[PDB]
Amino acid sequence: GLRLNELSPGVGAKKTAQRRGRGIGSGLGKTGGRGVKGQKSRSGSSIR
RNA sequence: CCACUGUCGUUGAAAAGCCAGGGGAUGACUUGUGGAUAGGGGUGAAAGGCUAAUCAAACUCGGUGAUAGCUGGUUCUCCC
Ligand SMILES: [Mg+2]
């Protein structure tokens, strides 16, 4: 009933997603939270 | 036709040659043209040799984005 220009989802409704490997300042650069080179840091790795 | 020795050359004149020497040179000889044998198959006076500069299993395409506990890389910012 407002404008299309001024509706908001409200606080807590939306969270921005994490993007791994986008620099130092993001807290997820380089390894992207995977730590260092073991089986878990590799691509198709799982928790069997 | 071959390839024993050496020098040279080794981003070569050349992805195997040159030069100087060397061996066979009527023979199990060399060579032209066409054909046959096809990949775990061929062919081999046998070196795992050769099968188009590719051979302890050719090449191309496809399964296929094979798999890779391995290596590398992984991109804006500030606060706790
Ligand atoms: Mg060859």
Instruction: Return the structure tokens found at A6.
Output: 């001024």
Cβ burial of A6 (10 Å; 0-12, 13-18, 19+) is exposed
Resolution rounded to one decimal, in angstroms = 2.6
* B18 C1' to A40 CA distance, Å: 61
Name the nearest CA neighbour of A41 among A30, A25, A1. A30
Q: Give the method of determination.
A: cryo-EM
3-class SS string, A5-40? CCCCCCCCCCCCCCCCCCCCCCCCCCCCCCCCCCCC
Nucleotide B67's nearest residue (CA vs C1') is A44
